[PDB]
Ligand binder design. Structure first.
Ligand SMILES: Cc1cc2nc3c(=O)[nH]c(=O)nc-3n(C[C@H](O)[C@H](O)[C@H](O)COP(=O)(O)OP(=O)(O)OC[C@H]3O[C@@H](n4cnc5c(N)ncnc54)[C@H](O)[C@@H]3O)c2cc1C
Ligand SMILES: Cc1cc2nc3c(=O)[nH]c(=O)nc-3n(C[C@H](O)[C@H](O)[C@H](O)COP(=O)(O)OP(=O)(O)OC[C@H]3O[C@@H](n4cnc5c(N)ncnc54)[C@H](O)[C@@H]3O)c2cc1C
Ligand SMILES: N[C@@H](Cc1ccccc1)C(=O)O
Ligand SMILES: N[C@@H](Cc1ccccc1)C(=O)O
Lengths: 477, 478
């Protein structure tokens, strides 16, 4: 248990029913606090949003999209993947939310980059790219070692041990050269009898280096990205519907747009509009999880140095687009089951689904891009976004990318009401971040921006837990 | 799609209801052949065997094991993982057998090897082992490049490109040194506010190189092992129960031990014992999928050079042991969800389950060893296998490995009736003997994973079946 049982009658109002808000309310309720959550949207989860058939969204440009994905088919427009260390998995267990493997690495997906080589714009599988890169890397370090270049820092025994590793890691010939490998894959698959198949031949050392085909390999090593990675069966939003149900909808007001938040003699008073009607609630403490750039728009009595600190958490651009295909060509033709293709094109990456394997249809994330390469979609209409995503995807996966398209749905987080940002980018552990960890009398800020895991649910959930702990210790004093 | 309708009445007898035999029968039926499968066991699938509560097996030493795993819990004693290129996945689609991801790579599982270093017998997570190994590897190659050691094979522009990659790949400092990385993981997890967490510090360069903690990294790159990998929900044997159902149990005789196979005037006559009785069946053709070392034991009229060729496929040793734990300590304490720990100990590896994540119990494959390191278990009783498995596993995963044990079940394939081998190794390894056995012996065709270029993969058995059925069909067409 996070905290013990509270003695007496104590109330909290939670602004925002995303992960930080719902986790706060869940934990406070467990301990015996009175809690009310005010959420502007008509769904729980915030930047955890799962698009299915029937989903409707009107963005800040006034364009309304209506998702028409087939029954049971979806994609996560925000959060989609979870590493093994995150407390998100602990809450999945507590809430009874089934998880499954998320394909965050795949030998069969493609890399495709521009360069001053003949590989420019050419799709190469990860396994082929890796075998060539690690083959030539190993050959080069083995050459230097045999030449005696590392004799000052490696003993004879060190050199022999290193050589053994390099021959294995690079699949080097007996004389220490990279000549290609079964690790690259096969143009024709090995079968039975005298059907030996046909190995894919290697690129040259200069092609590999000058093409930069290994630029994305270190992604595999990210602490928060390395396999094994996980995701909830049926969508990430299931975590937050589970929180909703445990908290009880009697304790959550949806469609409730907060317009004012003030420290008062009697606690904290929050005004909000729900169903076109003006409402007000007062509680002993408030937990404000509204994104920091949106807090200054509220009528408030926050001190000037607090309003200035909130402005330091700069909005960031990111977005996604999902296409439902009526044929799972990526599985049938490319032998790709999950994972992502990676590119320097604006689409940035194409992410293939982790469910309905071997079914008749599925949703492909045709882009997940951020920063400059999301600015390139942000201002386009959905029809224009789709046309650009299909053109760029066809340059990676061929003309099959343009066929058997049923429907599509996009989100751009800077253009999304009640978000207007994918995640915070603090100006310059900064002074403004540290300032916002302190309560403003009875108002506490919480969210993934006030964590060391920004753009992870873990960040939001750990922020909620720390803030609930601080409120509880205060009440005990 | 393989073949398109046969004209008239034609019959095939299939010896063995493992993957090759069942795939053969399935495709022949679809084309309009009369087919009968004779299978010695009471289950379909052969070396694809899934142990669950109720499974009973008496091995060739006379020991009987009775599996008591909880309902829904199992492990694959043979085949368990499938790469994306294998036709096994295409048959899962055709048969409606749902698949899920198999965790074949995991940053959080452990490596544990003996060496003449302080890391000898110490468990290190894959992510820490990789971060140190690739960090120092990258430092050393950058050092050699800067020195001018590779000036005869790399241009100025190549060297800068290589240096850029190495700084990123090895997470090097600005001045080119490996000094640790967040990639190693954390002794305290980064949280909110000023809770930054604490990184795990790096081992020293000579320790890392001499420990051999990177000796298994290349496994990740195997053509048939690289992620993404897959497996059927509920057990690998689900493929072969699905084949069974499509073929029809009326066309499969279980508990049918074949004793004779002979070419005769009208085709092939196969004698077998079933229900205690000596029975005979004659068909136009035969497809023999019995493991090659067991074919010689049959009464037969095969030519001497075919009998000699069958002996070249030497049997091998492999086995597994599964333990059901009543607490999923690997998830709750070690944050391991699937994957395998790897070691030089006899157990060889410890494989964590890919289903029932976050649940209350699970089966861990406490060893999967082959060759010399399976010979260490072969002659042990199950109780002795378990003790050895727990002792060695506790040296990798701690005292927790010894607690919350509910039940266990093991298989050793050389000691398993109607297998007596995990898979074949051809002497001289195509070899002449392999080539010879691709030819029909009048109306008898051999099929199985040993007659493929994917030995020890279901893909080998299935492609062998499809090639042999195509040969028979083209011959019947004329
Ligand atoms: C593109 C993208 C990719 C991501 N990838 C990952 C990933 O794969 N895995 C991972 O774990 N996480 C990922 N995340 C991060 C994850 O979504 C966030 O960390 C998490 O949603 C943060 O929760 P929060 O409660 O701090 O904020 P939010 O989710 O933004 O919740 C804030 C809430 O406040 C509400 N609100 C706003 N204004 C008002 C108002 N005036 N009145 C009342 N309510 C209001 C909003 O509607 C919202 O529900 C991703 C997010 C995005 C957008
Ligand atoms: C430990 C191990 C791990 C493996 N790992 C993988 C993996 O993860 N993925 C994968 O794809 N493959 C794996 N395999 C390989 C896979 O199991 C085989 O490729 C496949 O089972 C071969 O099929 P088969 O029909 O050639 O032979 P078998 O499966 O051996 O079938 C032969 C059949 O003949 C029957 N038989 C024997 N004698 C008689 C008799 N006298 N009369 C009647 N019937 C008889 C047997 O009972 C059996 O059913 C593994 C196998 C083992 C043992
Ligand atoms: N955590 C988010 C944002 C992110 C993307 C890429 C790398 C790091 C951060 C995600 O996994 O998509
Ligand atoms: N195909 C078998 C045997 C094997 C083991 C390791 C590498 C190559 C193949 C398995 O996956 O276990």
């Amino acid at each position: 248990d996070l905290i013990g049982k509270v003695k007496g009658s104590h109330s909290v109002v939670v602004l925002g029913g995303g992960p930080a808000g719902l986790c706060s309310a869940f934990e406070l309720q467990k301990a015996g606090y009175k809690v009310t959550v005010l959420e502007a949207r008509t769904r729980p989860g915030g930047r955890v949003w799962t698009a299915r058939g029937g989903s409707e969204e009107t963005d800040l440009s006034g364009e309304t999209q209506k998702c028409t994905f087939s029954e049971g088919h979806f994609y996560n427009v925000g959060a989609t993947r979870i590493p093994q260390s995150h407390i998100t998995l602990d809450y999945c267990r507590e809430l009874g939310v089934e998880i499954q493997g998320f394909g965050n690495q795949n030998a069969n997906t493609f890399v495709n980059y521009q360069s001053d080589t003949s590989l420019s714009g050419q799709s190469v599988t990860y396994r082929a790219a890796k075998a060539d890169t690690f083959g030539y890397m190993s050959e080069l370090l083995k050459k230097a070692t045999d030449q005696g270049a590392l004799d000052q820092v490696l003993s004879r025994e060190d050199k022999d041990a290193l050589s053994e590793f390099l021959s294995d890691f690079g699949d080097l010939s007996d004389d220490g050269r990279y000549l290609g490998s079964s690790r690259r894959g096969y143009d024709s698959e090995p079968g039975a009898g005298l059907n030996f198949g046909t190995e894919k031949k290697p690129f040259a050392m200069q092609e590999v280096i000058r093409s930069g085909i290994g630029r994305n390999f270190s992604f595999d090593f990210g602490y928060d990205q390395a396999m094994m990675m996980f995701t909830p069966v049926g969508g990430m939003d299931r975590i937050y519907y589970a929180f909703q149900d445990r908290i009880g909808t009697d304790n959550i007001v949806f469609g409730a747009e907060v317009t004012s938040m003030k420290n008062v003699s009697e606690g904290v008073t929050v005004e909000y509009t729900a169903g076109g009607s003006k409402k007000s609630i007062t509680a002993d403490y408030a937990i404000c999880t509204i994104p920091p750039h949106l807090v200054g728009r509220l009528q408030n009595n926050l001190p000037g140095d607090v309003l200035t600190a909130l402005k330091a958490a700069k909005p960031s651009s990111s977005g996604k687009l999902g296409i439902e295909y009526s044929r799972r060509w990526w599985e049938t033709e490319d032998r790709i089951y999950g994972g992502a293709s990676n590119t320097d094109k604006d689409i940035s990456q194409i992410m293939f689904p982790y469910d309905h394997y071997n079914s008749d249809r599925g949703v492909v994330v045709a882009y997940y891009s951020s920063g400059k390469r999301q600015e390139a979609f942000e201002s386009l209409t959905h029809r224009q976004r789709l046309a650009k995503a299909i053109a760029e995807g066809s340059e990676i996966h061929g003309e099959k990318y343009t066929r058997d398209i049923s429907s599509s749905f996009s989100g751009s987080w800077r253009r999304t009401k009640y978000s207007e940002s994918a995640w915070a980018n603090w100006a310059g552990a900064t002074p403004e971040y540290e300032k916002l960890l302190e309560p403003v009398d009875k108002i506490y800020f919480a969210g993934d921006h006030l964590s060391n895991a920004i753009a992870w649910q873990h960040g939001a959930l750990t922020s909620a837990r720390d803030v609930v702990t601080h409120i509880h210790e205060r009440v005990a004093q």
